[model samples]
Target: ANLLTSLVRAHLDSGPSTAKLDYSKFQELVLPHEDAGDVQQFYDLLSGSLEVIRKWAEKIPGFAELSPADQDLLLESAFLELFIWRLAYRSKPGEGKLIFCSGLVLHRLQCARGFGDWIDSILAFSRSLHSLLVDVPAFACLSALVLITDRHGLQEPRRVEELQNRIASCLKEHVAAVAASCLSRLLGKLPELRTLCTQGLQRIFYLKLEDLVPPPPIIDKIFMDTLPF
Candidate 1:
């Protein structure tokens, strides 16, 4: 919990608020493009954020104790979900824009050109998360829980499950009316998050099939091996 608290604080402090962003500059910088460079830029941006999340998770207690392969598996499985959650946390969905950590704001419609058709679902997911009113601690613990949840072929599923339960319990404490519908609503979103991950994978796969642009090696590996098919 202490680690998560510190991570959340650092994450929140590292970026400018979405409200301060200049939409005009955003428009100029991220215009619609069928060019692979634009798609590669988006992929690079997303992968960079995922790398940061992996580093933060590495600081969690007992995380390093897992074998290196297990570490990779867990990070890979949870990357998209964490990415979406972090994006949502930083976004102004009510304003119909997503604010990247770099302080660039992309309107929902503009995102579709670079991000593919699945972008709409991702935006809606972000808006729903925004409405949930999740606090910092809850968000932090929820991210941890998502990362540590059981995954196929984990060498130590029991250990991972234990960590997940600990995070889940801590998350409950941070939520309002732990036994009430609010908590349930929050927990219920996990399946939806997983569903989003599947859709995210499909989007990436579609990009690969289009062959317009080659994805970065890290993203290629993630699509080929990291996420569950």
Candidate 2:
């Protein structure tokens, strides 16, 4: 558990900081007069951040032991959940703004405009997460737990389950040792996170069907596999 926590912290410290966006520049580039180039840049930022997350997950112990297909499956299943988790972790919901890992800061209004109705739920989730004041190690373990949980169509469900159990145990022990008060609160968030993931998928499909702009391939794959007509 200690080792895993250390690795998570190390990655957090070493990984790239959230990308920064100048609001003025962003509006000029992609607001009311948006074009394909603007949309592409926006998705590019999202996909780029996701690629970095994929690499970070690869470094977790036992992750590389899984078959490549299984690895992709787990990543696809959990990417948006983890993405929101990280966003929540970085955000200051009391201020009604989100701070992306890439350093981009968007106000609630901007998020609502860009993300649609889903932004309200995300902001609410962010406020809840921020209120917990979770530390990096706890957040890391929680993310690992979210990723490794059993999911349908895995080539090796047992392997994934085993990893999930290990992280779960580690998270329990670590939280108990460091902050017992947070145990139930953090555990309670699991279901909420899963629900948020469902909402995220719905939003993705809504945008895809709307054809307002094409989603990035990575996001599109998630919709293709996870959504039922």
Candidate 3:
């Protein structure tokens, strides 16, 4: 649990500020001791920190206050944090970590964090990211979606549509199979996500999914549909 305690202390020390820290010190601190017995010790160390880290996260800046760019970073970090937490604590559906689905949902939310009119940007990002057609196309799509939305005044429907087309075109160019798969996965979730539409399409989409969805596979193939093209 020393590792967890160290992380908690570090997180608390950086309260309310997203300032980057020097990793060199912590890297040395976390290096495994010669006394290491088995992997369980490492697992226990991380697990011990879960609650503490969650509490520590509260000290970070809230989503609303950060600049568009910073906000995008925070959202991404949150996704990553939660993903790590899940992998450390929860059981995977199969072999992969289950954060891929979670990443997809967060990507959608990050898009909504921008103005409602940026749907095109969101779509374009998805297409481009999806076209990569790797195991984690949704994560790429979501990262781009968050990045594009962090800008101001790009929320008009015309802009959204235009961006969407661009994204779709990009997806077609890079990896149509992956893009189509991403869309199919997104469409499949629409019915459940429809309720969040009232909060500006983007925000609602994210909020609803956050409430409803779970993580993807990090190690095992949790979602069969997401398997290779």
Candidate 4:
């Protein structure tokens, strides 16, 4: 319970929680924005999240045991997937809203301009994920599992696999209300999340090629790092 509690607090409190800013005007970054402009905005928002997720992963008990290169490898690979998963957890599935780490809220129609079809795709995924009725602590484990994200080509696959299996065991214990079937359904979301990650990467590439605003350096770093070659 201590391990699970730390992971949950790290995941929820570090980055996903609301900020102190009293931006009653936070609503203005929405609709009718330029496609590249909106995508740039989205990239910047996610960049903030990527920073926090790094700290969150390092907090995972065994993560720092891996070689430094392997650590970056798994994290770089898992970055987009984790972002989508965390966002899905926070969203209002029925409301068609995408809420950012800063508590910035944008409606579905507004994101469609910047995100293109991917906006709708995530809303669908979020609605599907909401159906499993996952609990808070279990959701944190899943987020931790997402940090590992079943990484491949690691220099220490056996060690990372140990991490993975241990986390799954932890996952099951917290989700005592979960039927075995519910766990199956939860893991099933990974492939769909991967698909969304691919679409998201493509959107970044499109914006980069379009040059509406040059892609931010750190966002480009994530894009370049995760490419399968």
* Of candidates 3 and 2, the better by TM-score: 2
lDDT of 4 by residue, 152-196 (tens): 668888888888888888887766644467777777787888888
Model 2 weakest 10-residue run by lDDT: 25-34
Instruction: For residues 119-148, write the lDDT of model 3, one tens digit per residue.
Output: 333344334333433343332232223222
Instruction: Count backbone clashes in candidate 1.
Output: 0
Quote the lDDT for 137 in model 1: 70
> Per-residue lDDT for 187-223 in model 1, tens only?
8888888888787888888888888887888778878
Per-residue lDDT, model 1, residue 188, is: 81
Q: Which ten residues in a row have the lowest lDDT in candidate 1?
A: 25-34
Q: Alpha carbon lDDT of residue 215, candidate 3? A: 23
Model 1: CA > 4 A from native? 1-7, 10-24, 28-33, 176-179, 227-229
Best by TM-score: 4
Q: Candidate 4: lDDT over CA atoms?
A: 0.78
Query: What ranges in model 2 sit over 4 Å off?
Result: 10-45
Worst 10 residues of 4 by lDDT: 20-29
* Candidate 2, residue 208: how far the Cα is off, in Å: 1.5
